Design a protein around this ligand. Structure first.
Ligand SMILES: [Ca+2]
Length: 101
């Protein structure tokens, strides 16, 4: 179903990611943004209930992407994995695409 992935927001500020996501009405609504604070790095920003949480997408020498221990070959695979496995240590948070107008 190759369309643009409605999760990739390029370089947006952290506060803007929070403003757009806090308006979202579902838990797990999310985007990947390019970090202002760490150039060439990505952050994953997620509406969880009350609030918006940010994860840093970590990299290693082999160019893998990860949040915790499991390492992914692509951002696409990291995102999809977290559609069915909670991104959150404390809560059941599953990634779902934002809603556009
Ligand atoms: Ca909806």
């Amino acid at each position: 179903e190759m369309k643009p992935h409605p999760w990739f927001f390029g370089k947006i500020p952290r506060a803007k990611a929070e403003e757009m996501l806090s308006k979202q009405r579902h838990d797990g609504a999310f985007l990947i943004r390019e970090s202002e604070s760490a150039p060439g790095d990505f952050s994953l920003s997620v509406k969880f209930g009350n609030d918006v949480q940010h994860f840093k997408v970590l990299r290693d020498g082999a160019g893998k992407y990860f949040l915790w221990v499991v390492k992914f070959n692509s951002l696409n695979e990291l995102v999809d994995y977290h559609r069915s496995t909670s991104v959150s240590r404390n809560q059941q948070i599953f990634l779902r695409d934002i809603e556009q107008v």
